[PDB]
Swiss-Prot record, chain B:
Subcellular location: Plastid, Chloroplast thylakoid membrane
Subunit structure: The PsaA/B heterodimer binds the P700 chlorophyll special pair and subsequent electron acceptors. PSI consists of a core antenna complex that captures photons, and an electron transfer chain that converts photonic excitation into a charge separation. The eukaryotic PSI reaction center is composed of at least 11 subunits.
Gene that encodes it: psaB
Species this chain originates from: Chlamydomonas reinhardtii (Chlamydomonas smithii)
Family: Belongs to the PsaA/PsaB family.
Chain ranges passing through the membrane: 46-69
Protein name: Photosystem I P700 chlorophyll a apoprotein A2
Biological role: PsaA and PsaB bind P700, the primary electron donor of photosystem I (PSI), as well as the electron acceptors A0, A1 and FX. PSI is a plastocyanin/cytochrome c6-ferredoxin oxidoreductase, converting photonic excitation into a charge separation, which transfers an electron from the donor P700 chlorophyll pair to the spectroscopically characterized acceptors A0, A1, FX, FA and FB in turn. Oxidized P700 is reduced on the lumenal side of the thylakoid membrane by plastocyanin or cytochrome c6. Both potential cofactor branches in PSI seem to be active; however, electron transfer seems to proceed preferentially down the path including the phylloquinone bound by PsaA.
From Swiss-Prot, chain D:
Residue numbers binding [4Fe-4S] cluster: 565, 574
Binding-site residues, chlorophyll a: 674, 682
Record text on cofactor binding: P700 is a chlorophyll a/chlorophyll a' dimer, A0 is one or more chlorophyll a, A1 is one or both phylloquinones and FX is a shared 4Fe-4S iron-sulfur center.
Family designation: Belongs to the PsaA/PsaB family.
Species whose genome carries this gene: Chlamydomonas reinhardtii (Chlamydomonas smithii)
Enzyme Commission designation: 1.97.1.12
Transmembrane feature ranges: 63-86, 149-172, 188-212, 284-302, 339-362, 378-404, 426-448, 523-541, 581-602, 655-677, 715-735
Descriptive protein name: Photosystem I P700 chlorophyll a apoprotein A1
Alphabetical list of HAMAP family matching this protein: PSI_PsaA (MF_00458)
Annotated phylloquinone binding sites: 683
One record GO biological process: photosynthesis
Membrane-protein topology: Multi-pass membrane protein
Quaternary structure and partners: The PsaA/B heterodimer binds the P700 chlorophyll special pair and subsequent electron acceptors. PSI consists of a core antenna complex that captures photons, and an electron transfer chain that converts photonic excitation into a charge separation. The eukaryotic PSI reaction center is composed of at least 11 subunits.
UniProtKB/Swiss-Prot annotation, chain F:
GO cellular component terms given for this protein: chloroplast thylakoid membrane; photosystem I reaction center
Presence of keyword Thylakoid: yes
Chief place where the protein resides: plastid
Organism: Chlamydomonas reinhardtii
Protein's recorded name: Photosystem I reaction center subunit II, chloroplastic
Curated annotation (Swiss-Prot), chain J:
Membrane topology: Peripheral membrane protein
Name of the protein in question: Photosystem I iron-sulfur center
Domain called 4Fe-4S ferredoxin-type: residue spans: 1-30, 38-67
InterPro entries cross-referenced by the UniProt entry: 4Fe4S_Fe-S-bd, 4Fe4S_Fe_S_CS, PSI_iron-sulfur_center, PSI_PsaC
Organism: Chlamydomonas reinhardtii
Amino acid sequence: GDFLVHHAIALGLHTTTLILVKGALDARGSKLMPDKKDFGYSFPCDGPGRGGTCDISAYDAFYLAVFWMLNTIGWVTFYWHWKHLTLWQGNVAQFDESSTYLMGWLRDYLWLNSSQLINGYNPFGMNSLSVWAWTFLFGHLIYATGFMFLISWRGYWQELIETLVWAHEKTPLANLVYWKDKPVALSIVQARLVGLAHFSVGYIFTYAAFLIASTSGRF
Amino acid sequence: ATKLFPKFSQGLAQDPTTRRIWYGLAMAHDFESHDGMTEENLYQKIFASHFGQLSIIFLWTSGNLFHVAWQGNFEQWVTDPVHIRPIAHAIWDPHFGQPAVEAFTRGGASGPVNISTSGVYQWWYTIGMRTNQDLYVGSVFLALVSA
Amino acid sequence: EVGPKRGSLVKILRPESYWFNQVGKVVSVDQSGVRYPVVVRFENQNYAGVTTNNYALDEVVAA
Amino acid sequence: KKVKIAVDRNPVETSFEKWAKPGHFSRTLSKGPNTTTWIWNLHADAHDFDSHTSDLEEISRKVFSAHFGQLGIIFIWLSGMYFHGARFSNYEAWLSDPTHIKPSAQVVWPIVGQEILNGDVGGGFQGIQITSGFFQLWRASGITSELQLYTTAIGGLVMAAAMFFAGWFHYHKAAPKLEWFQNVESMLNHHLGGLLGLGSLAWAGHQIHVSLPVNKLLDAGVDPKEIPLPHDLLLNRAIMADLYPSFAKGIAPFFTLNWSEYSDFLTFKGGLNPVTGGLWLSDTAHHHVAIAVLFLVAGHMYRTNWGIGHSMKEILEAHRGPFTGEGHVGLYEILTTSWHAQLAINLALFGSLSIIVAHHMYAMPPYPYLATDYGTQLSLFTHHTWIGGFCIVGAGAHAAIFMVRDYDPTNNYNNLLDRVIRHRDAIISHLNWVCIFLGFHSFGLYIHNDTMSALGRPQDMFSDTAIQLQPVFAQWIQNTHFLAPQLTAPNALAATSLTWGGDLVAVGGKVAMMPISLGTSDFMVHHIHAFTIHVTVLILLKGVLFARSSRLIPDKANLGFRFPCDGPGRGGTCQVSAWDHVFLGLFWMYNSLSIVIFHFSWKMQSDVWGTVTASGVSHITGGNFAQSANTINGWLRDFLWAQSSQVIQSYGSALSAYGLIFLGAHFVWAFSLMFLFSGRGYWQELIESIVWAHNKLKVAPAIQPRALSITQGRAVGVAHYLLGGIATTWSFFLARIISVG
Amino acid sequence: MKDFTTYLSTAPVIATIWFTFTAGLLIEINRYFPDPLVF
Amino acid sequence: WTVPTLNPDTPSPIFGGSTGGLLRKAQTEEFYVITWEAKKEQIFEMPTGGAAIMRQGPNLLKFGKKEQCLALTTQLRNKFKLTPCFYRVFPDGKVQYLHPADGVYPEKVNAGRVGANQNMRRIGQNVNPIKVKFSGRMMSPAEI
Amino acid sequence: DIAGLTPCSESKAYAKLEKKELKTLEKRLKQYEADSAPAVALKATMERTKARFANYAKAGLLCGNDGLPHLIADPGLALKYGHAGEVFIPTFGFLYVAGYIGYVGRQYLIAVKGEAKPTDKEIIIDVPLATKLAWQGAGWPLAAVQELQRGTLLEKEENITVSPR
Amino acid sequence: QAALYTHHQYIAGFIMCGAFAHGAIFFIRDYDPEQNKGNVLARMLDHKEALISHLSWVSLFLGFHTLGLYVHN
Amino acid sequence: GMLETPVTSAPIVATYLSNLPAYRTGVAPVLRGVEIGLAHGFLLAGPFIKLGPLRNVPETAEIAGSLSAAGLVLILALCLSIYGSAQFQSTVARDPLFSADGWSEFAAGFLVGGEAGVAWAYVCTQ
Amino acid sequence: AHIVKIYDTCIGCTQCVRACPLDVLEMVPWDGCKASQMASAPRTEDCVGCKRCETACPTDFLSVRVYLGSESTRSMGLSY
Amino acid sequence: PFVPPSWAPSVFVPLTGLVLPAIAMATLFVYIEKEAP
């Protein structure tokens, strides 16, 4: 099980290095964009021409690499937490026998250690572990919110904002209060950053809450 | 018209949309991209930023020391570091009802407190801290160093 | 008469070109004083779906 | 003005010459491949018939042949189900014990250890427990042997060959003209009278002559081998007269307007059969008779070749008020010339009817021993709901396609459609506001409940004990339906369904159907459903109304229906096409229907399904829906964490495959995030590096490898997301409902 | 027949026949040699 | 050739009105006015949604941005073969002629025009960003 | 023995695991008759289980504390303690088949590259040429080594497209 | 132990991504090919296709084998 | 040009909108703010009094509700003041309300009227 | 405003001007190509950055380039 | 000593949560919308 998870760790490290190294070497230009060095480090794209140039800047390579970094650290922290949990519980054979198949990781580690966490508050009352349950759901909500900025893109939002602008401008008792800044949709780069920030915050808070709650309740 | 914010980018200041605020907030530390930036001024701005970051780090450390000396149980944790849980700081939340108050009241405290997981208790106990007076003196010294 | 012969194969030396270090067939060479008189047609298209381009006299090498 | 059979002889020659030429349908793909993108295009424009040519007649003929090929595929599928039920099933054993033997119709070969999936389903058989409900349907029709199912499979194969021959004949031997396809009046008259009315009448005849006596004898305790054959019942009047005295009078009471004599097989019993748990087949037969008469009457409404009847254009033009301008002028020409508009209308009504079918089938089980099979009930409701949602999204997509391609402003000056386009901004703004209002008042209640429960304040929550929000309208409607057979339904014996109220019906120790009570949790989840439906409608309607133009891009119609963007200009115009709106509507439909099926599963397993004990009924989860469904933590712990124990420990048993799929589905879904969170520029540069590696070893293909297009990347991402999520929920529901149901 | 053979020579038909042959060979190998874990 | 003068007393196409019309920007910042000559009455598509009927002779319309006016110009030129022209109107009453700039459409070459923002080199001949660093503001290597 | 593991022929957990599998199979078999299809299928599965366990113990595999076999990936340990059949011989077998498929595909690409329309030969497979190359690929390591020695395996730097740096 | 190890590992991952991001920023903003002519830095961009290709091969091999062994188990 | 509808062009609703304090166009902004604040405080005291955390304990539910309403009124007054500060910086008849001094007087009147409305709503239940 | 530049590789095919949706590009006389015309950008203050001109350019590499600059009302294409 | 009073959290928590953020938000909002001369 340790051998297999170490190979998974090596996979995560090599893929993250691949994305980062490729983005750093292709930052000055490639065959698709021979003049990428003249556009700066961060820019939206080169337009829909030449088949499409979405996520062509080096900033976008870093952006895609953050997900792989979070996934790699997630694997290493999952391995550390499970091995030490089985060691502290006095049964290392459980980890040695269930760390070779993913069902063991999903049931014996993620499902078995979250029983006390999600029981922090229920209709029968609550205990000191309710804050970690709230943090768990908080991180899940932030992660899912990041998925919105990650999947849905600018155009739809800008058109919706234009409709809202018309609605506010044609509403009595409310058009007297006008904005000082014209409301516009978030930019592509800003959208990627916002989605990445929500993804990372939800990821970190969810794992920290689960880790502390499971380790504190078990011991 | 042109707004005062941001002061480091006249192009962003002339932006009449909400993009101006977001971009001004996200490009404040990009010293090389400001208006009228030279090499000497760039290095000086980074020097000041380094000092400000050091002050923030030291003030945060002093805050941790102060809260452990005030609401923590370091004087009692050192006598029994196996069966006593460390206390981070107290909790003052008006939203808590009666069950939350008695649920968070643990670790030998008199009110709702947070049990620390940072491990500063073991580190401070190992380096020599024994009484809360030591933590208070360390917090005052680190706050003055940050200033 | 200046430039490569019509119908021959030349290599592209322009670094920013999609067909850099690639072979292409010569179509026509302009007889004026234009900067890029050589016309080169390639079997493989670029990302924009174009197979012909105009290159300078020193931008193409016989190969 | 004359309705006739117009046709062309031998328009296309039957040959294999075009089979060897890929992409011959389009002028752009007829050149051949040069890049890998072309290959994807070859599959993306395959069925895009209005893009190959602009001739409406060619498009209509291709549509007709495509319909025949589709029906041939469906007949092959049905014949396969009947053949599997006739040779690899335990239907004969299940007929002798429909309350203990689990239905099964699939066997696996003893290879690589998969024989463990051949679980002991009962009746001396080893297979995979099916949830399609074919056993109950065959029992309802009177099928009592494998020979009948085998004969039905052979008939289905013959029908499939006939459908394929019909498609080939109508495309290469006798192709109808465009005027034949535009006879919507005659088409509607035939589909109303002939198809629906004659089909309902034929099924009523089969139910009266086969389903009713065979099922009556099955419910009377007669062994399936001793029951007379259907032709035996159809040949003599003695057996039918013994089972139903009205048959001793022949068809004489029908022609003498003495239909009351047939009150033994045509009634209003209502409720459910206490022996089987399903609806009374006498009521279904009477239902089909009434439905057949109604559809046959409706089939003589439009004029075809005689003076009597209606003209739909006349009715449409006669409907015009002061607040709508001209009215429905030009709508008839729109629907008689655009296949996409008709597809949008048909897909919307078809999906809505599919969801209605799911609700009516769990509430009023029509097949015998169907309600007691919780697996079949849950799977059928979930399946029909998903099909309805997908069809609705497709309806919105085709509405946008019609608005982009077939719309013409020269024939829509001051009609309803033009006015809708004129005030589309007001429509979208109000729908956006109602979506925000519903989202706040629907999600804030759950968040507030989670906060109050976590803060140790259960008295400040939104529950039955605390502040209650009772659905008084639904409860009053339930009471009215329960009291209907005494005042407003004097000729009805019982109510339409048991969910309204009254006594519960249980068969074989399992609750077939009991009354359903709605509380605060039901109110909250119903508002959640309304909010999700409103948001999906907002995305689809925004993509339909703003398909031609918008305040951001005034010439969107020139860019087509499916295009990635208009560049990074104007701050960014990513996903402005109507196709992207359909792409986002797919995600919202998935979210909405997932919450719908979760609510259905929890409510059924908590307050309806369960065993029957001595002086009390115990449910599967113990009735925790009225106390734990008002919080997100309750849904995550009691419904997702607790109910997923069966799918995670299924390893080593006959349900282990489900667990494997439960893991596999988590992969595909996450795989979707690779195509949804990234862009093709990075992949194109990575492909360039890989191409360099190939060029070094002289292994570079002639077809230049190009990354997936932006639209293709979005389609791949949404497809994988939907497949992963739907398969995850499918494995969880099936494993759980099979283990504890 | 030339057009039919050319159609059968396309990438999806060839891929289907080849994968069916390879899958059948692997399945028959595991059938006549059950549970091979080592050489 | 002479610059046309805007005629405010010009008939407009018969349109029932829509919600995609002008906003507060037309009264606070600027707006655009498109005028054209139609040989006969014809139903056309409005760039902001809806179908209007262009009258015979002069026709005037108001739009919020220049893109709407040029989109309608392209639609009228490619579908009905007309010659439209538009201006930018300010709240103080100033009218500025925009397209066509010289009376001749920009697709065809016309005498008197002077090329601007043209680099007498190629993309591959641009300088490195390190050479344009530490400037007055963010400057791209192609701006010089 | 190696890494504190014991052979599967002398491991108690291995025998207990075999008894557990046979016990659950026999328990499932007790609910059926003797001359029925499910009983024959269960008996066949039990015989397959017995043969699998006997073959694994006969092969000399090393089991752990969980009763499951372990593979030896070190070439020295595998060739020194009789474990070359786990990871060594299958490694060379995959190398032969992998290079076999790669060489066949490379030969087909280079052969169709000099034709008039190589893209047609790529979407529509030339079955006779592909079959001939598939049968001729048995000498792939020899042909690949001879190609590497002649310098014709790789392409020169000047004939490959690169980025503008 | 659990919280400290996880905290430091996530911080290290973010810091590593930042190191590579700043390297890309160096290539776009501060790299000078004329001053770095023939050194190790220019040779990195000289054979960048080989580096990205070999990294792709390693990642592909590791992913296929680890996922295959896990699914097989 | 624009779209006309009976909802936005009925004379009765137009006269109703003209009779509102916001559309007087000729009165002092202090009177408008006082009227708006009173009408808002009277309705604002409701939700806090009948739904706050201390709604079940007697003799203090009205106290807590009125205090929360006054706090919300104060927050709204601060928002109105900063809105007039950041909105008017330079430059029928021009309404004096849409000016820096006019909006400041309007915000002060809104605060006064809001506190009076909260106090009047509390004594109305006593 | 965005920066629109025309390079000497322009063949004067006039496709970039027709693809421009806000009338930014035009054709001026020249002596570097057979068509004796060259694209020009004298109204960059109205350019939004849709890059339709870059898509319509057939030269390798492109002759017209768009660089996103300071955003304004005309550059963001706002009708409000 | 440096020990704060018993009532210190009851005054510093509402301060840091409602007084300081409101003043900071209002000041920053006014500063962002300041028009240049």
